[PDB]
Design a protein around this ligand. Sequence first.
Ligand SMILES: Cc1cc2nc3c(=O)[nH]c(=O)nc-3n(C[C@H](O)[C@H](O)[C@H](O)COP(=O)(O)O)c2cc1C
Ligand SMILES: COC(=O)/C(C#N)=C1\SCC(=O)N1c1ccc(-c2ccc(OC)cc2)cc1F
Ligand SMILES: O=C(O)c1cc(=O)[nH]c(=O)[nH]1
Length: 364
Amino acid sequence: GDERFYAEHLMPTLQGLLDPESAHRLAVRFTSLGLLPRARFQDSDMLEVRVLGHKFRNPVGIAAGFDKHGEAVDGLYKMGFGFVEIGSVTPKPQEGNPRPRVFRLPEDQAVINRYGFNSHGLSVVEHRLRARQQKQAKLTEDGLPLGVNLGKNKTSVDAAEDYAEGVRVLGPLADYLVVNVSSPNTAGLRSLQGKAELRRLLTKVLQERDGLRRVHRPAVLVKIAPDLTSQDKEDIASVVKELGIDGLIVTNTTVSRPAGLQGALRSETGGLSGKPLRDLSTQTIREMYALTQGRVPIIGVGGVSSGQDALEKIRAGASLVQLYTALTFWGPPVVGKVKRELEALLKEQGFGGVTDAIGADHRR
Ligand SMILES: Cc1cc2nc3c(=O)[nH]c(=O)nc-3n(C[C@H](O)[C@H](O)[C@H](O)COP(=O)(O)O)c2cc1C
Ligand SMILES: COC(=O)/C(C#N)=C1\SCC(=O)N1c1ccc(-c2ccc(OC)cc2)cc1F
Ligand SMILES: O=C(O)c1cc(=O)[nH]c(=O)[nH]1
């Protein structure tokens, strides 16, 4: 499946015919049925990473939001992702915001979304993952782990209890869990990144996680915004260390609108993803790595659409990367593209593998 054909004919046509939410629903459907380009790239040993208690056959994952309800996991591995993250999942089903709630900014290679945690809920996702639980166990053992990203319901009183319920229900079924406190589309949610709120929330999450039988006990990561103050970042790093949080996902979408955006839809409310987020996210990785002394694994995400973009985040401190918005524009071939370019650049820059490149900018 040609990189050129998808980039220059297929994705532009689908974009010309369908609004972005319809296009995404069709993509989830096709992916869930395995109707994808092959994909030929075979992962070399230079791309394997060991982190979070697992082997990852390659460091390129699908970011949360694409497969919100765990419907397409196997088709995402078939696409060539080293790991798959589903969600965000909320405790109770909820519809999210009214449509339209997602917008393309093609001149910016960006998207703005305001889905507001549309979710089938924990029970539905639980059963969906349970139907393939041993298939995933084998995938995980073969180097293809599964992450589950947890959110909170719009009308929930007690946010921490929403996250605890998620840990209890889906934790067993996940190699890692993500406490998503950085959606910009749920009122008040990002205030959970504040020191006191985060410590209270994560103490409860970790207690529930530690209460799970050893074989079912996932790593716990916290996904953070790209819009944090210095004080916020220092506070997060402190809490992450005080509690022994397994890792950080850096970053969610931005509420900022960087100067220079050209898309007609630039002033729509929501989080902005894609190329204009890229270096903001990279910078946030760099800072969090330094504040955590390189001892806390980071999954780097925001604006990755090439091997260079991947390597930049790796060298800034990410152990793994994810992408979401690049797919919208370039389609499935972009996965093998990132990986082939990443391997080439690692060789060019004198790294024996991804592992050797993690945090390399900090040792220069
Ligand atoms: C349409 C859309 C929906 C998303 N929904 C979620 C979500 O449910 N949970 C989450 O943690 N992040 C979500 N994200 C954020 C992505 O996981 C990722 O952090 C962000 O888009 C940056 O990566 P990208 O520039 O490669 O898209 C969403 C992103 C987009 C574009
Ligand atoms: C008419 O629609 C199609 O032919 C589509 C679609 N959609 C086809 S034909 C063969 C094929 O790979 N697709 C296809 C295109 C995009 C995507 C896709 C788009 C966005 C994604 O976000 C991460 C992930 C996958 C998935 C697909 F499975
Ligand atoms: O609106 C959502 O559901 C969603 C959007 C997004 O950009 N990030 C997130 O965590 N949730």
